Design an enzyme around this catalytic site. Structure first.
Site, PDB file in Angstrom:
ATOM      1  N   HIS A  61       0.831  -1.221   0.000  1.00  0.00           N
ATOM      2  CA  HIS A  61       0.000   0.000   0.000  1.00  0.00           C
ATOM      3  C   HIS A  61       0.856   1.258   0.000  1.00  0.00           C
ATOM      4  O   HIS A  61       0.456   2.296  -0.512  1.00  0.00           O
ATOM      5  CB  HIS A  61      -0.939   0.018   1.206  1.00  0.00           C
ATOM      6  CG  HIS A  61      -1.640  -1.282   1.424  1.00  0.00           C
ATOM      7  ND1 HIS A  61      -2.692  -1.704   0.637  1.00  0.00           N
ATOM      8  CD2 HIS A  61      -1.333  -2.325   2.233  1.00  0.00           C
ATOM      9  CE1 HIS A  61      -2.989  -2.955   0.943  1.00  0.00           C
ATOM     10  NE2 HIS A  61      -2.172  -3.354   1.903  1.00  0.00           N
ATOM     11  N   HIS A  91       5.726   6.922   6.598  1.00  0.00           N
ATOM     12  CA  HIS A  91       5.462   6.502   5.233  1.00  0.00           C
ATOM     13  C   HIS A  91       4.876   7.689   4.498  1.00  0.00           C
ATOM     14  O   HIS A  91       4.618   8.730   5.104  1.00  0.00           O
ATOM     15  CB  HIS A  91       4.458   5.347   5.207  1.00  0.00           C
ATOM     16  CG  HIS A  91       3.147   5.680   5.847  1.00  0.00           C
ATOM     17  ND1 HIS A  91       2.900   5.570   7.198  1.00  0.00           N
ATOM     18  CD2 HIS A  91       2.020   6.211   5.309  1.00  0.00           C
ATOM     19  CE1 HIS A  91       1.659   6.037   7.429  1.00  0.00           C
ATOM     20  NE2 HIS A  91       1.089   6.436   6.310  1.00  0.00           N
ATOM     21  N   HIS A  93       2.143   9.059   1.055  1.00  0.00           N
ATOM     22  CA  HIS A  93       0.995   8.816   0.188  1.00  0.00           C
ATOM     23  C   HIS A  93       1.323   9.751  -0.970  1.00  0.00           C
ATOM     24  O   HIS A  93       1.712  10.901  -0.741  1.00  0.00           O
ATOM     25  CB  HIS A  93      -0.313   9.238   0.862  1.00  0.00           C
ATOM     26  CG  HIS A  93      -0.646   8.431   2.077  1.00  0.00           C
ATOM     27  ND1 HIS A  93      -1.379   7.266   2.020  1.00  0.00           N
ATOM     28  CD2 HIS A  93      -0.303   8.599   3.375  1.00  0.00           C
ATOM     29  CE1 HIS A  93      -1.476   6.751   3.233  1.00  0.00           C
ATOM     30  NE2 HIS A  93      -0.831   7.540   4.073  1.00  0.00           N
ATOM     31  N   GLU A 103      -3.362  13.430   1.157  1.00  0.00           N
ATOM     32  CA  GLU A 103      -4.622  12.964   1.708  1.00  0.00           C
ATOM     33  C   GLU A 103      -5.342  14.191   2.257  1.00  0.00           C
ATOM     34  O   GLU A 103      -6.479  14.481   1.874  1.00  0.00           O
ATOM     35  CB  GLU A 103      -4.353  11.916   2.786  1.00  0.00           C
ATOM     36  CG  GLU A 103      -3.602  10.707   2.224  1.00  0.00           C
ATOM     37  CD  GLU A 103      -3.885   9.433   2.979  1.00  0.00           C
ATOM     38  OE1 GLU A 103      -3.555   9.361   4.178  1.00  0.00           O
ATOM     39  OE2 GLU A 103      -4.443   8.499   2.369  1.00  0.00           O
ATOM     40  N   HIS A 116       3.667  10.878   6.622  1.00  0.00           N
ATOM     41  CA  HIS A 116       3.017  10.575   7.889  1.00  0.00           C
ATOM     42  C   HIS A 116       4.000   9.944   8.867  1.00  0.00           C
ATOM     43  O   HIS A 116       4.490   8.840   8.632  1.00  0.00           O
ATOM     44  CB  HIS A 116       1.842   9.619   7.670  1.00  0.00           C
ATOM     45  CG  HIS A 116       0.663  10.259   7.007  1.00  0.00           C
ATOM     46  ND1 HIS A 116      -0.346   9.511   6.455  1.00  0.00           N
ATOM     47  CD2 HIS A 116       0.384  11.577   6.854  1.00  0.00           C
ATOM     48  CE1 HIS A 116      -1.215  10.381   5.979  1.00  0.00           C
ATOM     49  NE2 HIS A 116      -0.820  11.645   6.196  1.00  0.00           N
ATOM     50  N   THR A 195      -5.936   6.556   7.972  1.00  0.00           N
ATOM     51  CA  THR A 195      -6.489   6.823   6.647  1.00  0.00           C
ATOM     52  C   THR A 195      -6.571   5.592   5.753  1.00  0.00           C
ATOM     53  O   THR A 195      -6.949   5.691   4.586  1.00  0.00           O
ATOM     54  CB  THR A 195      -5.685   7.906   5.921  1.00  0.00           C
ATOM     55  OG1 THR A 195      -4.366   7.420   5.660  1.00  0.00           O
ATOM     56  CG2 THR A 195      -5.609   9.167   6.772  1.00  0.00           C
ATOM     57  N   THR A 196      -6.209   4.434   6.299  1.00  0.00           N
ATOM     58  CA  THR A 196      -6.295   3.180   5.559  1.00  0.00           C
ATOM     59  C   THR A 196      -6.948   2.182   6.492  1.00  0.00           C
ATOM     60  O   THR A 196      -6.895   2.339   7.713  1.00  0.00           O
ATOM     61  CB  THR A 196      -4.908   2.599   5.174  1.00  0.00           C
ATOM     62  OG1 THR A 196      -4.202   2.218   6.361  1.00  0.00           O
ATOM     63  CG2 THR A 196      -4.087   3.611   4.406  1.00  0.00           C
TER      64      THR A 196
HETATM   65  N1  LIG Z   1      -1.556  -0.389   9.017  1.00  0.00           N
HETATM   66  S1  LIG Z   1      -1.819  -0.207  10.577  1.00  0.00           S
HETATM   67  O1  LIG Z   1      -1.095  -1.220  11.279  1.00  0.00           O
HETATM   68  O2  LIG Z   1      -3.235  -0.114  10.811  1.00  0.00           O
HETATM   69  N2  LIG Z   1      -1.162   1.202  11.044  1.00  0.00           N
HETATM   70  C1  LIG Z   1      -1.392   2.473  10.430  1.00  0.00           C
HETATM   71  C2  LIG Z   1      -0.573   3.548  10.807  1.00  0.00           C
HETATM   72  C3  LIG Z   1      -0.760   4.825  10.253  1.00  0.00           C
HETATM   73  C4  LIG Z   1      -1.787   5.029   9.303  1.00  0.00           C
HETATM   74  S2  LIG Z   1      -2.016   6.657   8.613  1.00  0.00           S
HETATM   75  N3  LIG Z   1      -2.050   6.503   7.031  1.00  0.00           N
HETATM   76  O3  LIG Z   1      -0.882   7.460   9.012  1.00  0.00           O
HETATM   77  O4  LIG Z   1      -3.293   7.137   9.070  1.00  0.00           O
HETATM   78  C5  LIG Z   1      -2.630   3.959   8.899  1.00  0.00           C
HETATM   79  C6  LIG Z   1      -2.425   2.679   9.470  1.00  0.00           C
HETATM   80 ZN   LIG Z   2      -0.577   7.518   6.061  1.00  0.00          ZN
END
Ligand SMILES: NS(=O)(=O)Nc1ccc(S(N)(=O)=O)cc1
Ligand SMILES: [Zn+2]
Ligand SMILES: NS(=O)(=O)Nc1ccc(S(N)(=O)=O)cc1
Ligand SMILES: NS(=O)(=O)Nc1ccc(S(N)(=O)=O)cc1
Length: 257
Positions: A61, A91, A93, A103, A116, A195-196
């Site tokens: 992702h 990470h 996006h 986002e 993020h 957000t995922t």
């Molecule tokens: N993939 S997870 O283990 O649920 N952790 C996670 C961590 C950060 C985000 S986000 N995109 O920063 O909101 C989304 C998911």
């Molecule tokens: Zn994110």
């Protein structure tokens, strides 16, 4: 399963993750004129001098630069936060074109990408327990625009060829995340969610107003990654962003006037 395609994208997530239509979902559009300066906000503190990166992973992702969070290192505090939040991973996006990718949006403006930096509230012991709390996480969001290269991002860019496909990981030690921050810490903050999927509503979002500049060459390499695993049809990892969600009963606060 879930992804960013026509058949498994953001519009489909609610079927397996009903909270997708929840009361505090992220991201959101940041209406700068409606956001209000909050004098109750304490100075924001980003202390990454002791950050210890471990590995980088293509999870199908996005790609995550993971940190060793077993000790009191790399912490975020102050601002709207109560207590200390520990950095666990960061990470991005991004889009298929420079005109989209972020986002969160600012007055409906979409940036080329969004960083993020994920932290968990130390009062909860670890990340797993933290994501079961309304104030378990704090994500520092930073916008990326295309212009001058970001020197501190190059080491990340140059290791991407070794984690082209889903499931691939690579050693990634001694990376200093301080090289990814803009000069100013002015920010907007509001209560939101991941957000995922699972889209859990445990995040205090802190989105910096000043974007960082990255070069066209750097973001182009982000776009060479694959959503697919090795040996499968190639689908470029691009447009891995969720669109703005209803603000509902929430107010966005500004750290500056
Ligand atoms: N993939 S997870 O283990 O649920 N952790 C996670 C961590 C950060 C985000 S986000 N995109 O920063 O909101 C989304 C998911
Ligand atoms: Zn994110
Ligand atoms: N969260 S979700 O997008 O509804 N999940 C999902 C969406 C589509 C499929 S699939 N590959 O079409 O069966 C599988 C899982
Ligand atoms: N806890 S640790 O082993 O030191 N580091 C770590 C870093 C990131 C994750 S994850 N899967 O991104 O939530 C899990 C563990």
């Amino acid at each position: 399963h879930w992804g960013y395609g026509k058949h498994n994208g953001p519009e489909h997530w609610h079927k397996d993750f009903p909270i997708a239509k929840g009361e505090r979902q992220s991201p959101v559009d940041i209406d700068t004129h409606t956001a209000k300066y909050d004098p109750s906000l304490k100075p924001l503190s980003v202390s990454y001098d002791q950050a210890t990166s471990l590995r980088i992973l293509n999870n199908g992702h996005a790609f995550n630069v993971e940190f060793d969070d077993s000790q009191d290192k790399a912490v975020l505090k102050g601002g709207p936060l109560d207590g200390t939040y520990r950095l666990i991973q960061f990470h991005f996006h991004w889009g298929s074109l420079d005109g989209q990718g972020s986002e969160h949006t600012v007055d409906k403006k979409k940036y080329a990408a969004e960083l993020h930096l994920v932290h968990w509230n130390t009062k909860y012991g670890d990340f797993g327990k933290a994501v079961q709390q309304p104030d378990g996480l704090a994500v520092l969001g930073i916008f990326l625009k295309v212009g001058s290269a970001k020197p501190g991002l190059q080491k990340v860019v140059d290791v991407l060829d070794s984690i082209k496909t889903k499931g691939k990981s690579a050693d990634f030690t001694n990376f200093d995340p301080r090289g990814l921050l803009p000069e100013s810490l002015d920010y907007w903050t509001y209560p939101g969610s991941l957000t995922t999927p699972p889209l859990l509503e445990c995040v205090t979002w802190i989105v910096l107003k000043e974007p960082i500049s990255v070069s066209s060459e750097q973001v182009l390499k982000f776009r060479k990654l694959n959503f697919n695993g090795e040996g499968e049809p190639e689908e470029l990892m691009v447009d891995n962003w969720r669109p703005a969600q209803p603000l509902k009963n929430r107010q966005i606060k500004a750290s500056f006037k």
